[PDB]
Amino acid sequence: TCPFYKKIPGTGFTVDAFQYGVVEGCTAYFLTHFHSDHYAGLSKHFTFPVYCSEITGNLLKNKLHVQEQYIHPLPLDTECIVNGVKVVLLDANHCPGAVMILFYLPNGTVILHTGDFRADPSMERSLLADQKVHMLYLDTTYCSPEYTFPSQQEVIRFAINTAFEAVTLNPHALVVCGTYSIGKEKVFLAIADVLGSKVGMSQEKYKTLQCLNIPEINSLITTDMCSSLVHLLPMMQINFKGLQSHLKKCGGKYNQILAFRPTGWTHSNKFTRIADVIPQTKGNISIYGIPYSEHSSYLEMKRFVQWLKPQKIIPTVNVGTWKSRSTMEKYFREWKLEAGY
C-alpha cells in the first residue's frame, strides 16, 4: 500500500509510486527520474499513463520496454494541463532526465515535489520566482550539518588533474571508472576528454547512454574496449580482485590501473579536503574514492528552503525512524525562526 508522502491531495496523481499495484483513484502516475528505488515496479505490462521527462521516457521505452502508448513526455519550463490540472516540470540538477514537479491545485494551493535534487542558486530564477508554494515535498537525503562535500566542479578538477598526471608519467596506465545507475557521467566524460580517448563500456551501458540526449555522444563513447584507455565497469568490480581480473583481459596492453569510485558522502569528508585525498593502493592498482554528489548538501538545502519559504514541509527521505523524523523537524523550525517566515 502506497504511503501518504507519495500522494498529491486534490488530484488523481501519484509520484514515484509503481511498486504498490493499482493505486485506488490514480489517473496519472508521475516518474521524477530513472533510478531503481523510484521506478520499482514498472515493466512492458504497465497499462496506465506515465508522465515524465523526454529522457526518462527514452529509458522507459528502451530499457524497461514500457509501450509507447503509455509514455507521456513533457517539455521542461512549460505550463502543461494534465487531466485538468496545470503542472510544470523543472530541472532537478540530479541525474539526466531528473525533474521537480510544480502542481497548481484546483483549490488555489501550489505544491512543489523536488524528487531527488541538488539545490542550486540558479533555481531562484526559474518559474519558482513567480509565486508562492504552500507545500514542499523535499529530498532530505543529507539533512544534517555533518553532511559536507565540495562543488561538482572542484571534484571534476581533481579527477582530470589526477588522471592526466598519471597517464603522462606512464602512457601504459589504464583508467577505470565505476558505475551502477545513470548519473555522474561528467566523471568519466571529463577524464576521457583530457586523455584524448573515447570511453569504452559494455553493450548494456552503451545502450543506456544512448538514451540520454548528450550532445555529440557518438564522438565520446564506444563498445570497442581495445581502442579506449578509459573503461567503465560495474561499481561492484571496483576493488583489487576485480581490477586484477580486468587487467588480465587487456592482452598486456597495460601495466597499471588507476580507478575512480564516485560515492556520495563518506565520513572521510569530516576530516579531509578534496585536495588532500589519497588512494588505496596494492601493487600496480590504485583506487580513489571521490565525493561527487547529485544530492543537496545541508547548506545548499537550507538556502533553498529559506528562499522558498514554504508553509509546510513533507520529507521524502529518511522517513523510517522516529529519531530521523525528529531531527529533520528541528532543523525546519530553526530555519523558519532564523529567516522569519
Residues that bind Ni ion (CB under 5 A): 35, 116
The residue (of 10 and 41) whose beta carbon lies closer to Ni ion is 41
The residue (of 35 and 302) whose beta carbon lies closer to Ni ion is 35
C-alpha cell at 180: 551502477
Contact between 265 and 258 (Cβ < 8 Å): no
Contact between 97 and 107 (Cβ < 8 Å): no
What's the closest the beta carbon of residue 51 comes to Ni ion, in angstroms? Answer: 18
Chain breaks in the chain following residues, C–N > 2.5 Å? none
C-alpha cell at 333: 523550525
The residue (of 35 and 261) whose beta carbon lies closer to Ni ion is 35
Measured at the CA of 254, the angle between CA 249 and CA 257, to 5 degrees, comes to 90
What's the closest the beta carbon of residue 95 comes to Ni ion, in angstroms? Answer: 6
What's the closest the beta carbon of residue 296 comes to Ni ion, in angstroms? Answer: 12
What's the closest the beta carbon of residue 31 comes to Ni ion, in angstroms? Answer: 11
The residue (of 39 and 158) whose beta carbon lies closer to Ni ion is 39
Residues in Cβ contact with 103 at an 8 Å cutoff, skipping those fewer than 6 apart: 8, 11, 13, 85, 86, 87, 110, 111, 113
The residue (of 35 and 231) whose beta carbon lies closer to Ni ion is 35
What's the closest the beta carbon of residue 59 comes to Ni ion, in angstroms? Answer: 13
The residue (of 116 and 257) whose beta carbon lies closer to Ni ion is 116
Distances (CA, A) of 253 to 201, 224, 228: 17, 14, 11
What's the closest the beta carbon of residue 37 comes to Ni ion, in angstroms? Answer: 7
- Report the distance separating Cα 319 and Cα 173, nearest Å: 45
**Which run of H or E residues covers position 60?**
helix 54-62
DSSP string, 238-267: -SHHHHHHHHHTTTTS-SEEEEEEEES--G
The residue (of 98 and 328) whose beta carbon lies closer to Ni ion is 98
What's the closest the beta carbon of residue 294 comes to Ni ion, in angstroms? Answer: 7
Relative to beta strand 280-282, strand 99-104 is: unpaired
